[model samples]
Target: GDEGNIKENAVRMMECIVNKDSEKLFDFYNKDMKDNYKDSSLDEIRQLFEYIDGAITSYNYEGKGGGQEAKNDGIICYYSCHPEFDFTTETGQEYTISFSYHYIWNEHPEYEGINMIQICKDGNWGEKLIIGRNY
Candidate 1:
């Protein structure tokens, strides 16, 4: 099912984040994928993933769920997750930050896959911005 694939993609992306494997991560990302990660670029996205992987010694998904709608041109995947990341601050203080991600994926022609509109730092899973489409 498409929904299954979406969930699979999310899992793969998370693994890529933890491993800091850009090649594996980017494969899931549509080249035309737009990022809503605070004015982030391709390189910035890579760096952010790497930073999160390195800073956060461990991460666990508290919960995750999503829905999918198929359009004539593409499939849209709406997903959210409550994730906790263990990290050390600049001052070397260890802490855990919990955040949610709301995302929408669009099928891409050239990439033959999906591009994502990912909204990060979303509070409580529902208040995240619509970054993928707007940004």
Candidate 2:
């Protein structure tokens, strides 16, 4: 069930990328991210997706993994998981995207949604554009 949910979010994320729907994409972030990043920054994300060059033609999961982290002497915790995908665009460009989701425990409600989304383009997998984050 967890894996399915992760994959589902990945598809929805790619849809936003393909459609260039900045608003819907911004809505995927956690509260802290929304608060930290002004809505004006949505256009920043839109601009990054513009690098796609063409509509995303297809994608496949690379794999998935997760773990937990603690802070404040373990008083606050985060259970996080990510599903990564490799996408191909009509223009023949490829992108690797990673979506991070978090489960907040004990406090920090703002961290309870999608924690981060990052994308790397054209086989230069080391350099990522951070679409958004709360971590």
Candidate 3:
């Protein structure tokens, strides 16, 4: 599914995370994907802003999207992707994470949603495309 949309959306999701914009969290949930999150605690959300907020020595990320699914069904065109990320904690310790997303696109005004998402705890730069998933 290395067409474009999925990869593009993958990158967009990261921007939402880094910017701490839960307002944009709107796109990553719906139906099957909605359950990935449970609580709406702003406290937890604040903690999420930091693997070590303000204490970072460095931060970096790379995501190669385009894991788009079938096109015949415009009812819901899906994109599955593998995106990688790494950040330096306040203690200057580095950690990495990877996400696999099931991005859906279609006619609804909400048009698209993250049908699902999964996680890889420690990821590397040379990761391969995950054609179908939600991380």
Candidate 4:
């Protein structure tokens, strides 16, 4: 169902990256971002996922938090999920990856899907690599 939880979507996103399915990955983006796309190409998505080169060997949920936003449509509720993943490359090199998945409620059609995707490389949680602008 489209009405999925933050953790579910967050993990699915990493799966998409590992599978190199930019189309499926882009499908998870919120309407606001889709509306701004320049074309049908997955170039943007590919660029964002290019660095994700290994298979996910392990993962764990860090935590989750969310709140409402004062939008013109009304008070739109949202939530975020955080997950940390360990990857092992073809040559057996290991590294950590983490991302934050931001989602809006189904009631808010205009904002449905992931509102933001924030990633951290090599366990550096302090540095965020944002996709489709900052949240």
The residue ranges of model 3 lying beyond 4 angstroms of the native Cα positions read 1-12, 31-57, 65-68, 73-76, 105-111, 115-135
Task: Output the TM-score of candidate 4.
Answer: 0.62
Tell me the tens digit of each residue's lDDT in model 4 across 78-99.
5444455556556455455555
Output the lDDT of residue 85, model 3. 62
Best by lDDT: 2
Please provide, for model 1 over 1-135, each residue's C-alpha lDDT reduced to its tens digit, 9 standing for 90 to 100: 455543555555666655667566555543445333324434644645533323435444434434334545464443334334434433343433332233444433433333343333423335432222221
lDDT of each: 0.43, 0.72, 0.49, 0.59
What C-alpha root-mean-square deviation, in Å, does candidate 2 show against the real structure?
3.7
Better-scoring candidate (lDDT), 1 or 2: 2
Better of 1 and 4 by TM-score: 4
TM match of model 2 to true structure: 0.76
lDDT minimum window of 10 residues, candidate 2: 1-10
Worst lDDT run of 10 residues, candidate 3, spans 126-135
Off by over 4 Å in 2: 1-3, 69-77, 104-106
> What are the models' TM-scores?
0.44, 0.76, 0.47, 0.62
Candidate 4 local distance difference test against the native: 0.59
Give the 10-residue window scoring lowest on summed lDDT in candidate 1: 126-135
